[PDB]
RNA sequence: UAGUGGUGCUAGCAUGCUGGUCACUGUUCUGGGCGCACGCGCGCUACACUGACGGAGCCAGCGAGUCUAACCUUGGCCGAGAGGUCUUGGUAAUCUUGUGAAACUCCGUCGUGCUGGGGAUAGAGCAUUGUAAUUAUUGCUCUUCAACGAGGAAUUCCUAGUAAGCGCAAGUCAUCAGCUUGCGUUGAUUACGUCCCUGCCCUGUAC
């Protein structure tokens, strides 16, 4: 058998995000290419056309490995260091509006669902889908 | 370091670890001075010959790679090759010469 | 074909630089404003400025000075809710430091602290 | 003076004939001995390597190392 | 003519305070939304009486209320604004709208290191 | 340590401006300018006064010494401003040229500065304001210190001014070289 | 009030593997003040490629919290952000909290140009604490882009999980630190000696 745990992290992400863009069901907010994704950032995402799908794949993988997550925890994960000009650096959380829509978009296509005890959990169909991409990723070598 | 050895495996063809050893042994000074004022010439122990070799090599690379177009590995690899040869082009060899000729005058 | 220097809005721009960065020679055109304008013009961001043809420098010039028609979110603009007329504007070229170097003089005329302190320092 | 940033046809011919002369090549090697900017060299290496004129021995974003073979 | 954010001067004076606050920037809107104290009401009471009895200008009324917003009802009045020490005399021209009174009376001298 | 006050009495009586504070320093304090040295050995001040008096007895661009007693010295106050913030002088080629010729004079007088650098030149258009730890031309490192001064002044004209019978471009020779009064004040090296 | 494994239920993959859900180890009121030609000192941020920016990977320890009423806040929803709103757990090895921290690692863009280094000074607008933010507490967005090319004479701290790099928590506290103390992460070079300098402690004649 094969699991998502059996594949290199960035290798899996690149494979799945490219596939997900071809499916076309993943729906974009449309304000994309304006938002910085974090108040700590400078300049927007450089891969202007593709970056939304690649983030969507990352979220799915991260939830797959864990019991459940919520929007607050994701904002922490994708945070970073803000320069504060002449002052010392500090940790700052990333944009919420992005990540909440990603969860809702992934739910529309049935990969993920709202869970008791709050937050979201992987669907059995999510498992079934992500495992199949993993098997292709190994065999495509 | 990993990138540095690879480069030396292509510029020249020897087992590059041997080239490192040659550079070290050829660089370490064998005579020096101390202040008395004036300076008096003195011999230097084999251990310190090794320490001086390593210090001079990295400094010669570091100051070449500042405001560079060549990466660290590109410059460090060249120092090692130049020092395995008798090549006075290298910074570390230039430094060795002055220490010994100064010491000669004061002995 | 390739042009090494070009002139627009009475500013000179050299062709040898990425188009997004080259435009920031113009007063008022910051990096983010420059970046978003190019996207709406759908020029190739990776082209160097000397590659573009006249009909492609136009449209860009047009969008810079009429930004609200292209549904730029207004909060992107540097002159929101103007004091005389509640319209929003973006200020460009020599028109920058003509509204600046005026609002302070308007404060001088009203004998406000900040105007006095500025001109007293001079 | 400034290095070239767009590929003239004459330099393209120059590149293909001369590069196999060198034992070792890298981004710095091209930018030093040929008057091209670094933003060309990154593209040219991917081109010539896929063309098979030079042999990769290691690649690491910040460093890449190609050889006569 | 003068105009304020597109509203013409002749429609000003007619505009009420609770209308005017809708044009003002965030600091003013919060101040009124957070509930301005009663203290201006006594000042406003006196200021109206002086204007009404005036033969031509109304002559100064003086106050400590440096933290008070300039509002169209008081255009044209002459006011003496306390300075921590002295009073400074000012006439409310229309351009002063939305400023604080404190901006017109300098609490400190220049310094010149003579 | 009341001598730190009472020491005035000779100068206070023999000297008429009250002066003003200019700056605290580690070895000395400075206050129409008065310099006060810093219990006994400082009455060093005589060495400084006679040294400055000699150089000003020569034609050199140095402040005129007036008077000196009890570790107190009085000097001409400088009109200029410190060279380290200069950026736009109208004749940088002559300024470069003639700063070089100043070094030649010291060498001809047998003396070399330790730190002929922008921290002690004030704005010929310039004056040299102090001579810490000067050495003779005969000292064993005279040429080493000599060439340091030449390169130090060259570096400044390159970095800020972009400049790079006389010396420099427009003259036969680019800059002087060491091979091309010490016995009265034997600061070091006879 | 902790962990592992089995046992019961159960999902995906393949014909075992990774996850979810019994045993063991005097008084008082209103307004102002606590400005800068310059000298001295402890700090913060930089001068870039051993880098800046974008995306992805993903790891701690020491603290602290409410019924006096309103502290630390999970989850859902709204918005570019700052922020708002509806519910919830914890008087605590039990909940916030695996405090998913930064440096760091990998894949791209940039190409030696005060440049995409650096972000002072300044203009417009939106929020938040407070009785009150003008001479301006703090946060967010766009625009303006200054000096600075590794720094003279002088001078500080330090011998191993130490220096240095990097970040967090507490303190004060309506709000507000570039401060103080404590904690963790990554982790060197150079001695293992002396009385030269500085300073301290012992035992009569040129002074």
Swiss-Prot record, chain A:
Component of the ribosome, a large ribonucleoprotein complex responsible for the synthesis of proteins in the cell. The small ribosomal subunit (SSU) binds messenger RNAs (mRNAs) and translates the encoded message by selecting cognate aminoacyl-transfer RNA (tRNA) molecules. The large subunit (LSU) contains the ribosomal catalytic site termed the peptidyl transferase center (PTC), which catalyzes the formation of peptide bonds, thereby polymerizing the amino acids delivered by tRNAs into a polypeptide chain. It comes from Saccharomyces cerevisiae (strain ATCC 204508 / S288c) (Baker's yeast). Changing residue 100 to E: Decreases mature 18S rRNA, protein binds 20S pre-RNA complex poorly. Lethal in double RPS19A/RPS19B mutant. Belongs to the eukaryotic ribosomal protein eS19 family. Present with 29000 molecules/cell in log phase SD medium. There are 2 genes for eS19 in yeast. SMART domains: Ribosomal_S19e. InterPro entries: Ribosomal_eS19, Ribosomal_eS19_CS, WH-like_DNA-bd_sf, WH_DNA-bd_sf. Pfam families: Ribosomal_S19e. GO terms for cellular component: cytosol; cytosolic small ribosomal subunit. The keyword Kinase does not apply. Changing residue 13 to F: Partial loss of function; decreased 18S rRNA, decreases binding to 20S pre-rRNA complex, slow growth in double RPS19A/RPS19B mutant. SUPFAM superfamilies: Winged helix' DNA-binding domain. It is found in: Cytoplasm. Keywords: Cytoplasm, Ribonucleoprotein, Ribosomal protein, Ribosome biogenesis. PROSITE patterns: RIBOSOMAL_S19E.
UniProtKB/Swiss-Prot annotation, chain C:
This is Small ribosomal subunit protein uS13A. It comes from the Eukaryota. It comes from Saccharomyces cerevisiae (strain ATCC 204508 / S288c). Component of the small ribosomal subunit (SSU). Mature yeast ribosomes consist of a small (40S) and a large (60S) subunit. The 40S small subunit contains 1 molecule of ribosomal RNA (18S rRNA) and 33 different proteins (encoded by 57 genes). The large 60S subunit contains 3 rRNA molecules (25S, 5.8S and 5S rRNA) and 46 different proteins (encoded by 81 genes). There is a cross-link at residues 27, 40, 71, 87 (Glycyl lysine isopeptide (Lys-Gly) (interchain with G-Cter in ubiquitin)). Its main location: cytoplasm. GO terms for biological process: cytoplasmic translation; endonucleolytic cleavage in ITS1 to separate SSU-rRNA from 5.8S rRNA and LSU-rRNA from tricistronic rRNA transcript (SSU-rRNA, 5.8S rRNA, LSU-rRNA); ribosomal subunit export from nucleus. It is found in: Cytoplasm. Keywords: Acetylation, Cytoplasm, Isopeptide bond, Methylation, Ribonucleoprotein, Ribosomal protein, RNA-binding, rRNA-binding, Ubl conjugation. Belongs to the universal ribosomal protein uS13 family. One of its GO terms (cellular component) is cytosol. Present with 48100 molecules/cell in log phase SD medium. There are 2 genes for uS13 in yeast. The modification N6-methyllysine is found at residue 39. GO terms for molecular function: rRNA binding; structural constituent of ribosome. Transmembrane segments: none annotated. The chain holds residues 10 to 131 of 146 of the full protein. N-terminally acetylated by acetyltransferase NatA.
Swiss-Prot record, chain D:
One of its GO terms (cellular component) is cytosolic small ribosomal subunit. The keyword Ribonucleoprotein applies. One of its GO terms (molecular function) is structural constituent of ribosome. It is found in: Cytoplasm. The keyword Ribonucleoprotein applies. GO terms for biological process: cytoplasmic translation. Disulfide bonds: none annotated. Keywords: Cytoplasm, Methylation, Ribonucleoprotein, Ribosomal protein. It is presumed that the precursor part of S25 is engaged in assembling of the small subunit, thus being essential in ribosome maturation. Belongs to the eukaryotic ribosomal protein eS25 family. Component of the small ribosomal subunit (SSU). Mature yeast ribosomes consist of a small (40S) and a large (60S) subunit. The 40S small subunit contains 1 molecule of ribosomal RNA (18S rRNA) and 33 different proteins (encoded by 57 genes). The large 60S subunit contains 3 rRNA molecules (25S, 5.8S and 5S rRNA) and 46 different proteins (encoded by 81 genes). Component of the ribosome, a large ribonucleoprotein complex responsible for the synthesis of proteins in the cell. The small ribosomal subunit (SSU) binds messenger RNAs (mRNAs) and translates the encoded message by selecting cognate aminoacyl-transfer RNA (tRNA) molecules. The large subunit (LSU) contains the ribosomal catalytic site termed the peptidyl transferase center (PTC), which catalyzes the formation of peptide bonds, thereby polymerizing the amino acids delivered by tRNAs into a polypeptide chain. The gene is RPS25A.
From Swiss-Prot, chain F:
Autophosphorylated. Changing residue 72 to V: In RIO2-1; nuclear export of ribosomal 40S subunits impaired. It is found in: Cytoplasm; Nucleus. The keyword Transferase applies. The active site is at 115 (proton acceptor). Present with 10300 molecules/cell in log phase SD medium. Required for the final endonucleolytic cleavage of 20S pre-rRNA at site D in the cytoplasm, converting it into the mature 18S rRNA. Involved in normal export of the pre-40S particles from the nucleus to the cytoplasm. No longer associates with pre-40S subunits in RPS19 disruptions, suggesting it acts after the ribosomal protein in 18S rRNA maturation. Belongs to the protein kinase superfamily. RIO-type Ser/Thr kinase family. Component of a late pre-40S ribosomal particle, composed of the 40S ribosomal proteins and the non-ribosomal factors DIM1, DIM2, ENP1, HRR25, LTV1, NOB1, RIO2 and TSR1. This is Serine/threonine-protein kinase RIO2.
